[PDB]
Amino acid sequence: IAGPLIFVEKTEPVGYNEIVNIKMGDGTVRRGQVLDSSADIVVVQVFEGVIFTGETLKLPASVDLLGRILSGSGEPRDGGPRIVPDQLLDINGAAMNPYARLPPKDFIQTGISTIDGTNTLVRGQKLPIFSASGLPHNEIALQIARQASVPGSESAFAVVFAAMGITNEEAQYFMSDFEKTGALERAVVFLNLADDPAVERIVTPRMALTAAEYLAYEHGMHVLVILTDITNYAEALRQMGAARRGYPGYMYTDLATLYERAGIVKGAKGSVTQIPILSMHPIPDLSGYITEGQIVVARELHRKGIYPPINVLPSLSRLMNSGIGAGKTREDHKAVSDQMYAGYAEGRDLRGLVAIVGKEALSERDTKFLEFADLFEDKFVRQGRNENRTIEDTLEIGWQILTHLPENQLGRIDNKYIQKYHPAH
Amino acid sequence: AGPLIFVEKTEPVGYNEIVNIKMGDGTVRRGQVLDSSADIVVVQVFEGIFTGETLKLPASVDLLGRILSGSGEPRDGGPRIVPDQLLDINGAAMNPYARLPPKDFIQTGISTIDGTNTLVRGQKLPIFSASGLPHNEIALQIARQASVPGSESAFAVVFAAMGITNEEAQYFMSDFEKTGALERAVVFLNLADDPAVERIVTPRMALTAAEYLAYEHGMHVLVILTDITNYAEALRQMGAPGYMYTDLATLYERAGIVKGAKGSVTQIPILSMPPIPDLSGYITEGQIVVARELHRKGIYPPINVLPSLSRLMNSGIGAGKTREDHKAVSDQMYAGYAEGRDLRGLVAIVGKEALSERDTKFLEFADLFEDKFVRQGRNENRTIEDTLEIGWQILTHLPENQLGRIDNKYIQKYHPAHR
Ligand SMILES: Nc1ncnc2c1ncn2[C@@H]1O[C@H](COP(=O)(O)OP(=O)(O)O)[C@@H](O)[C@H]1O
Structure with missing residues (x-):
């Protein structure tokens, strides 16, 4: 109350x-x-x-968690035996402060160009997938789970996927996709079903995070946490005890107990990175979860049959500068990123100019920019469901479609990088 | 086709x-x-x-001070159309845009905008909210408060409202009338019933009028578009090519510095929730978020700065623009507030007294920031100087050696602990 x-x-x-x-x-x-x-x-x-x-409710903490599929309470769901701990950890975050006073830093490679390319995810970041009902956000998030890595990090990598208020159908879908690809081997999965007790749904995220903290801190790992639906979580929150629609007042404080739980850990040798999934009668403000940017799923792109339907113009990564550049990705990263962004907006703008003046009334220049916004969508944004791109491969794609523009029209790439990188140099 | x-x-x-x-x-x-x-x-x-x-607006400098009706006709009982130009409405009218980047300062008198997510001349900055939230109230305040300090061009407001109730329209009218604001503004009002083809021409009537005043009269024009969601709803209620995504494009393409560089068209479209649509196309140069959490707390205006953003802010701020310290004060408040909001999570989990002294001073700052920088009177017009001074004010509460984001030059000069 x-x-x-x-x-x-x-x-x-x-x-x-x-x-x-x-x-x-x-x-x-x-x-x-x-x-x-x-x-x-x-x-x-x-x-x-x-x-x-x-x-205090505790998590049976163990390295053995990896490769296991559990419920919201962290009870085995795979037929396996119960979890033999060596650490019973307070699920409420209130027993260990693993988090250091360090800004989030290096590169996490998702394999997704519209993320890695222009909205780079950084170790120890909070970066939600802003979506809506009926878009393939889950498909994205489990692609990200099958593909993420930390290039050249001497700290090992793990993923903690937590899915809440889900159906038996989509439960069976994650379990199979995690096992038959092998992504499960480096992952602890927590699946809460729309059926299981409302309460169990609510601990699901604190179980997932607590685990992440255990691997990050006490095993020196980079952990990526993925939470399928924070709107499903809110809903569960508005059906607790006394509660005539809308949401509790403590929702805001409550969510903060979730999104305070991320960052680089004491000793710098591990980290917790969050990718919450925010979908969309009830009108939940999940604003506080969006302090470092967000990645945006666009129905527009979905309609043209583009996967993943990610819209970079509204997407954002506030910490991208901390994770790109020489010895992290490559020096031309900011350049390519800036130039594509600039060029895609222009071409997107010009789709309007087209439908004012008519196609043939456009300047040669403009037609190239219009054609680029096209090449950007078909070649950059579009990407297979199981197509893992190295940033190297992503930056190369960027360059390949930038060639479509006048070289005198790349005000975001110093000659320093066009001379060195541009496919005709 | x-x-x-x-x-x-x-x-x-x-x-x-x-x-x-x-x-x-x-x-x-x-x-x-x-x-x-x-x-x-x-x-x-x-x-x-x-x-x-072709339908066309009677473009004329006397559009100022008039309240019109989406269709272009008068609603203030005033005299009819007094043409000077008769300009097409689609966007072809003048081809008036000098393909240059946005560049100067727009003072909204709203600290959460001005201070943290600065509105630049020639920008599209969508304000983003949901129903039940006072976006129209903000939009309305910006209309009367907005100004361009240090600009040797004239300023002008074009306010266009879509699919609104009688009461809203009467409210908007009186507000413009009584507050002496209409003296500088063109106002297009479209009622939620009058019919629909008319809601559609509204924004185009507005932007043509803006492009007219900015380009042909060397003015800096803010175009407040109140509710693109209404616009979207009318767009599906009709027809069977120019199809929403493309059609919005004809809308969000119409902003920027105009040829001559002696004027500009800046656009603030309101985007609300909750049915369809996807209007992300309107978001490319930033956004201002209206948060229900802040509203259920009793704060006006309920802008959350953390998720808000202006991609073009650095072009509007600094030396001959606002003040030199702007960016430092703006970053440190952003970092200080972000931090304090997380510690609300931490407090909940460990307990108020389990919390560090430093962490406590941050937690207390998140409160000062919401209570003093964000909270602002419906009719208080804060100069950027006012905005920055109250910043430095609430900053004092932080341990001086915790201000990473501000170079010592500004601390030694602006920090109140040493005037
Ligand atoms: N922190 C944020 N909070 C809310 N919306 C954001 C935030 N950051 C970006 N956005 C943008 O807001 C849009 C959501 O609104 P959208 O569905 O596009 O239009 P509408 O909600 O008006 O129909 C997304 O496209 C997203 O890019």
């Missing part, structure tokens, strides 16, 4: 509104009120002495 | 109807009838009987 909202391990019968004490991993006890509970997990609303004192 | 145009309906006409049209140019083109309305025929022209003239 008012939050903050922590997750306790239903160990003995609780009642609604019960005042309970929660004993943190720290050794300190926080007072709170029972909000709601499933059958194994209790949801408490904290405040800040012979009453119930409960244990 | 080819481009859409708009013609005066001399008489009734069918469909797929081959017709002759007299452009403002003087050349005659043929096409077909897309949609027979009442006052206006939508034509699909050929190569880039019935005798018709």
